[PDB]
Ligand binder design. Structure first.
Ligand code: NAD
Ligand code: CA
Length: 239
């Protein structure tokens, strides 16, 4: 089952640190860890084994990387989450938290993204150009040259190659200034789950993280606890 789990706890820890100090990786926070386990992770495991479908397929995550002072999405400071391998499938990346939702009812999920991922952020581009015509185009459907004709600055264009997210985030990373949560749509597989996110200041976060980690162990996925904040990712032995 090692081909499905992706390694033991020590191998996953070493994997996520290596990625964190290289090109980065992903962090998906979750308000309902029971739902994430039961309705996202477990269907993905069943599909890996040949049973069900990965119906949800695409999930939101933030890009994290050593030295990048990046916030995660946790408005009430009460979330746990998953540290997710850079090898998860990328459906699109934006530096803005915009309106891009999950796969809607009745839409085919596996290729909903990148096709329906906005190729640029309309709100940011409009504030920067005051170009009315931005709202007369389908942002999911424009090409590079249409974006040029609209005058869309590159700062507002989405990224579709993982290796290129770190180039996008290079200037914020160097300045050390806190950046708002960025957002990627990713399709993670069970083997891509490398760690459990813990906010060490939050009793809610730790209680939820302990339950999620125990639930994952029952399926043979033994994950390290990872305290991420402010461009540092550090292990917690327990809790
Ligand atoms: N979660 C992150 O790390 C992250 C990162 C960047 C931006 N955001 C933004 O935060 C807001 C909340 O997003 P979120 O990811 O916390 O919630 P979500 O959309 O992933 O899940 C919300 C709720 O819907 C269900 N759900 C979970 N995954 C689902 C899926 N794939 N399809 C359908 N239903 C699903 C569960 O009940 C869950 O509690 C959104 O605006 C999002 O763009 C979140
Ligand atoms: Ca959003």
């Amino acid at each position: 089952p090692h081909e499905i789990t992706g390694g033991n706890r020590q191998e996953k820890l070493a994997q996520l640190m290596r990625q964190f100090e290289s090109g980065g990786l992903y962090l998906r926070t979750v308000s309902d860890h029971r739902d994430e386990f039961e309705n996202t992770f477990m269907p993905k495991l069943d599909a890996c084994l040949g049973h069900g479908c990965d119906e949800r397929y695409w999930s939101s995550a933030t890009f994290i990387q050593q030295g990048l002072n990046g916030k995660v999405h946790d408005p009430h400071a009460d979330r746990t989450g998953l540290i997710i391998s850079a090898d998860a499938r990328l459906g699109g990346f934006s530096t803005f938290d915009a309106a891009t939702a999950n796969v809607p009812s009745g839409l085919e999920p596996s290729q909903y993204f990148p096709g329906q991922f906005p190729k640029f952020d309309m709100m940011g581009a409009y504030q920067a150009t005051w170009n009315e015509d931005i709202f007369s185009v389908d942002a999911t459907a424009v090409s590079e040259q249409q974006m040029d004709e609209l005058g869309i600055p590159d700062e507002y264009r989405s990224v579709f190659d993982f290796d290129r997210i770190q180039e996008k985030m290079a200037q914020p990373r160097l300045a050390g200034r806190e950046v708002e949560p960025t957002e990627a749509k990713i399709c993670y597989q069970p083997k891509d789950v490398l760690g459990i996110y813990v906010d060490v200041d939050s009793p809610a976060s730790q209680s939820k993280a302990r339950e999620l980690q125990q639930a994952m162990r029952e399926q043979g996925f033994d994950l390290p606890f990872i305290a991420y904040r402010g461009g540092a990712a550090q292990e917690l032995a327990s809790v």
